[PDB]
Symmetry: D2
Subunit: 210 residues, 4 copies
């Protein structure tokens, strides 16, 4: 499973441990359908969330730095990211579409905002290459690159923490760009843990957009 | 399926595992993609030797453990993990108790024979258990009645833990300063870890393991 | 501040970093009415991270079965007496007869209390005999019952503390830990009155603290 | 209260502290000079680190985003940062000094690298103001700003986690810029917990520069 997001981003599922029944087993402390599904709803409605910690996902995410900064505020998870100091990058940048501004009364056309963003990114990138060419190390030269530069990371997260992430980020108060990522995370979650996901939406989900 | 017996009635059972040694390699490189055994194994050693531990967080285990409460209290001090335990207030229990073997005391100068210590422990547990049943029979709820049961009562739990936190657990508990009973559990955890992540385990022993027992035992 | 709990337990405040204004400063990243209004605003909209910048240290004396529940709260720091090495006072929680009032028992509540006292005395005497004969503490203590009192230090931030109160200052929690949670709430209220009142009004999910002053 | 200036416009300021060296001693003994100092050394040399969690600091930090991204990887701590979406910013940028490049054979003089960095940040900043003036919301407009933009945050952290931070960041493998911040954090730590700090350097500190 891989879902494209924004202009060059994506969320890709790398691995998953367990499924809905992993939470049921943990709740019953028992290794060895209607009753199991009823238990999942029960746990969710009463806030008995610890059993959901025994379901774990690993994702591979490509996102602009400003999105990644918000995402990385979720401390109850594991992250490994490309190195700005040492890694080869593709040097791609998130350029908002004109539709992103639709809704706001701007004194220049949305298409022109897009163009100005693209221009300043190109200038920053060209300054960066000149610095590199003249022998400035990457860890210094890259500081002139803008916040819409794409990075990549691995994210390992359990279903309880993932639900918190969806509560906060799959919500209209979150920035639109990370909402888009959160929708994709939700889709993958739903595919792998349909009972947990449905119970979550029904009883515990605090956001609006799902 | 891996299940190892511990103490007189305890066990550690593997329930599930996400990933393997290559999960750490992929996370370190940030590449979901190009396998090369010698370079991959070299990267695991490199990470371990230089203390780059975050890639090991992407390997995760779930165990099912049966252990006496005094062991579980030590275990549950490891906060970077997930636990679900039987309820003392509401769950059915089997009411089994850890009775140390006479060999457990061999090593200490005692004024009574080790066999007699074992017997006295068995006796007081039986008395406690019988008092407990009398309380239950007379209508005292379990959450109150169970407080007279001793600390060697067995409980069960699920434990989900990543390999980084697992290595911390082994550093601290697979060690002669840890209580002998929890050492026995830690050796079983190590055996399972070794079986599932042999490269990580070997690199851990070689570069990062701070304890004493796992360099001797196998 | 030290509050007695159960028959021999307590909660004592050791230290506190900050006060209500610590959360205000952290939220603003740098007039009492506007500051109090901000605390209510944060609490009402679920902006909880600023409350992480208020921290408490408590010293708690509680029976092991209560401590086991308490220590499930992972987002906190604990240091407890060593069962293997520490000197203990060997005291035990004996429920009062009133603790059983509410349950139809076939023996009088006073008799339940007595039977508990008896079995703890027997366990404790067996323990002393084991110790006297040279059995090390780390082994001998395993015969002691779960109502043995222990002590610990607990360092915890106000956000995690509010989670603790949501779960433990609540009628679904065991009565014994409810009593501890009420004392924690009293101390919290004394040190962070605005946070506490906003918590009760907008975020508290339990039942007992809306009833009990 | 203590404030140390870092880089060209950054700082680390101590906001508050709970406890001191004796807080760790009290927690280790569970009880409310030579023997106390000896206990701190003992704990440190044997890796008995949990008592140090009962010492807690709050800092106020002003640092460039690229430094903040490294810092915020330390999950065992609490953070509150200025909002890129909603907060007023001062719009200041870290411009490396010519001495920062000394050590590297560059084909342009270090002073010219500094100038080029200043230029591209000015251009990015001016593009940003134009976008703002034309009604583009801040959460979109700010994505063109470079990674050397200064941000501010509150950081609450216990001494155990602070020692892990110093092991990793007060070290020559860490980027030079965050080394400077780590040195200031270490200064403050030393001032408030001298026995802990000395024991840490003696027995546990894994880095080189302290
Ligand atoms: C719409 C929106 C606007 C935002 N604006 C800002 C802003 O302007 N500035 C800013 O700095 N941040 C901002 N954030 C980030 C926000 O403050 C949180 O950092 C982020 O939402 C992660 O939430 P969390 O702490 O619940 O998640 P995690 O860090 O994954 O924590 C998960 C859960 O564990 C608990 N937890 C984890 N660590 C601790 C701890 N140390 N103490 C107590 N409990 C803990 C809490 O229960 C938490 O819910 C914003 C977030 C959103 C959604
Ligand atoms: C031989 C031995 C004797 C012991 N004796 C006692 C005793 O007498 N009394 C007692 O109370 N305990 C005792 N313990 C328990 C010990 O203090 C730790 O609670 C236990 O070893 C868990 O270790 P941890 O904190 O490293 O693991 P975890 O809690 O799993 O944490 C793992 C890592 O995450 C970090 N971490 C997690 N949470 C925090 C935080 N809040 N702040 C900073 N860093 C954090 C640390 O880097 C830590 O190493 C003993 C342990 C051993 C092995
Ligand atoms: C009435 C009652 C009955 C109970 N019965 C049982 C029982 O039968 N068996 C049993 O085992 N336990 C039982 N518990 C304990 C319960 O399962 C929790 O362990 C305990 O309430 C601590 O809650 P917490 O996880 O929110 O707290 P903390 O562990 O302090 O965590 C605080 C917050 O941080 C986040 N967090 C911390 N660590 C993680 C993680 N690893 N993954 C995801 N999120 C995390 C969550 O947002 C959490 O709310 C019971 C608790 C109560 C109150
Ligand atoms: C020189 C240098 C280069 C780096 N390069 C990169 C890079 O290229 N890419 C990249 O992504 N990162 C990089 N990092 C960041 C690094 O991987 C860590 O994210 C960062 O150093 C924080 O370390 P920490 O995990 O020990 O701290 P914290 O996250 O504060 O954790 C403190 C301690 O708690 C424990 N802990 C906390 N959470 C968990 C958990 N979920 N599981 C297990 N244990 C836990 C560990 O014991 C840990 O030491 C680099 C760091 C340095 C110093
Ligand atoms: O919607 C938001 C706004 C801000 N931040 C955090 C991320 C970063 O640390 C800082 C940026 O202002 O605050 C978020 O996580 N989400
Ligand atoms: O020295 C470094 C290099 C990288 N990173 C992390 C921070 C950020 O998330 C990403 C930048 O490459 O990796 C660090 O924390 N420290
Ligand atoms: O009300 C309860 C019941 C159980 N537990 C946890 C504590 C211990 O780990 C185990 C005992 O059943 O479950 C609690 O935390 N609170
Ligand atoms: O070897 C030990 C000794 C003590 N403790 C912790 C467990 C419990 O909370 C308390 C009991 O002494 O201290 C351990 O974890 N390991």
């Amino acid at each position: 499973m891989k879902i494209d997001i924004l202009d060059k981003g994506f969320v890709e599922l790398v691995d998953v441990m367990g499924n809905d029944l992993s939470a049921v087993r943990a709740a019953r402390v028992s290794f060895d359908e209607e009753r199991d599904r009823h238990l999942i709803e029960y746990l969710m409605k009463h806030g008995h969330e610890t059993p959901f910690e025994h379901i774990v996902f690993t994702f591979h995410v490509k996102a602009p730095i400003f999105v990644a900064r918000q995402w990385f505020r979720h401390r109850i998870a594991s992250y490994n990211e490309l190195s700005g100091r040492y890694s080869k990058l593709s040097y791609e940048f998130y350029i908002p579409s004109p539709e992103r501004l639709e809704g706001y009364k701007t004194t220049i056309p949305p298409e022109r905002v897009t163009e100005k963003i693209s221009e300043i990114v190109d200038k920053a990138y060209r300054t960066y290459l000149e610095l590199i060419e003249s022998g400035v190390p990457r860890e210094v030269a890259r500081i002139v690159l803008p916040l819409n530069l794409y990075t990549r990371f691995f994210w390992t997260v359990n279903a309880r923490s993932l639900m918190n992430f969806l509560n906060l980020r799959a919500d209209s108060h979150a920035q639109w760009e990370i909402q888009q990522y959160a929708l994709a995370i939700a889709r993958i979650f739903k595919e792998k843990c349909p009972w947990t996901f449905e119970a979550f939406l029904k009883y515990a989900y605090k956001g609006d957009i799902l």
